[PDB]
């Protein structure tokens, strides 16, 4: 984990996320939306289990991205919860929740759910 | 369960659902959207654990509603997964998934997640 987590990860939609896993569980980095142009970067912050494992389990982690930067404000935030599996073909398998700020009448429809698999390739 | 489940349930949004729990696990009934006018009814079908319990656990159940009837076609379906807790103040606590049919480009945003608590009052 940690050293294995630090780096660039790509998902099946063309998004790129670059993160540094700190010694004590911190996750810091940026998320880049497709196209890959400057203004597609958002800050991400999260945490991971720095002491995961005699039975080959994955490392639990999660991070959040608020979709606001100096070019866009999508008035929403997404959190990814999942685990890191290292090895020849390491991957981070996640499920995410994307919540948009709504008025109280639309609160019932404010959150979408999905899943993403990130690889180093 | 079963006899305790059969009846009318109301949620915190003003929706009403009337169901019959069959001896062998079937759940059949109708869901009515707010206002309460004719055209607000949709068919619901589901299943529940007909043999739940020496430790006061709830009864697991789930049901589905496709949002199409003879007045409306919202091209979506919702499934509610939860458990029935009977007693003085019985309730069905659920989490739901609402998926809309989308083109493949919007598939990533096709499902919303929420929760509902239904009571008999």
């Amino acid at each position: 984990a940690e050293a294995g987590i630090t780096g660039t990860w790509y998902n099946q939609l063309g998004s790129t996320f670059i993160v540094t896993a700190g010694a004590d569980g911190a996750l810091t980095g940026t998320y880049e939306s497709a196209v890959g142009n400057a203004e597609s970067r958002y800050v991400l912050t999260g945490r991971y289990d720095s002491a995961p494992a005699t039975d080959g389990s994955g490392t639990a982690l999660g991070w959040t991205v608020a979709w606001k930067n100096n070019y866009r404000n999508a008035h929403s935030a997404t959190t990814w919860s999942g685990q890191y599996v290292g090895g020849a073909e390491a991957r981070i398998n996640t499920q995410w929740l994307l919540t948009s700020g709504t008025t109280e009448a639309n609160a019932w429809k404010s959150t979408l759910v999905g899943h993403d698999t990130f690889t180093k390739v | 369960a079963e006899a305790g489940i059969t009846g009318t349930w109301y949620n915190q949004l003003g929706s009403t659902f009337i169901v019959t729990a069959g001896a062998d696990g079937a759940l059949t009934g109708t869901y009515e959207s707010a206002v309460g006018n004719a055209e607000s009814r949709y068919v619901l079908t589901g299943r529940y654990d007909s043999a739940p319990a020496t430790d006061g656990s709830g009864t697991a159940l789930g049901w589905t509603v496709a949002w199409k009837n003879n007045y409306r076609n919202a091209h979506s379906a919702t499934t509610w997964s939860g458990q029935y807790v009977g007693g003085a103040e019985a309730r069905i606590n659920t989490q739901w998934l609402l998926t809309s049919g989308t083109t493949e480009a919007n598939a990533w945003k096709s499902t919303l997640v929420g929760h509902d608590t239904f009571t008999k009052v």
Binding site: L13, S15, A34, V65, R72, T78 | W108, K109
Partner: peptide, 8 residues
């Protein structure tokens, strides 16, 4: 939305 695929 910035979390989506390319729109292309």
């Amino acid at each position: 939305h910035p979390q989506g695929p390319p729109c292309k």
